[PDB]
Amino acid sequence: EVVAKLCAHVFCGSDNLQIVPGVRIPQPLLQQSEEEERARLTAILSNTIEPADSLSSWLQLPRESILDYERLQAKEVASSTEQLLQEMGSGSGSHH
């Protein structure tokens, strides 16, 4: 269903899609020049800049889930460090 919604957003669109909040992709023009349209899309890519919150803004998922995944990665690291510290004498907290 995630793939389905992304296909509903990226493909279905008329004259203005706004894949990301900053960029708008206009549908082909009446001049019907393919070199001109290539240059047009290259320019629409050159003008835009990837925001800092790109993983939460360009991807429709929110920022809370970003913080959660970061927390998860940190928890993995800390747990592995503690388990390594107990297997070779380095943890007074666990000690009894």
Swiss-Prot record:
Signal peptide interval: none
Location(s), subcellular: Cytoplasm, Cytoskeleton
Oligomeric and partner information: The dynein complex consists of at least two heavy chains and a number of intermediate and light chains. Interacts with DYN3.
Chain's role: Cytoplasmic dynein acts as a motor for the intracellular retrograde motility of vesicles and organelles along microtubules. Dynein has ATPase activity; the force-producing power stroke is thought to occur on release of ADP. Required to maintain uniform nuclear distribution in hyphae. May play an important role in the proper orientation of the mitotic spindle into the budding daughter cell yeast. Probably required for normal progression of the cell cycle.
Comment field (misc): Present with 195 molecules/cell in log phase SD medium.
The family this protein is said to belong to: Belongs to the dynein heavy chain family.
Domain remark text: Dynein heavy chains probably consist of an N-terminal stem (which binds cargo and interacts with other dynein components), and the head or motor domain. The motor contains six tandemly-linked AAA domains in the head, which form a ring. A stalk-like structure (formed by two of the coiled coil domains) protrudes between AAA 4 and AAA 5 and terminates in a microtubule-binding site. A seventh domain may also contribute to this ring; it is not clear whether the N-terminus or the C-terminus forms this extra domain.
Name this protein carries in UniProt: Dynein heavy chain, cytoplasmic
Organism: Saccharomyces cerevisiae (strain ATCC 204508 / S288c)
Full-protein positions shown: 4005 to 4092 of 4092
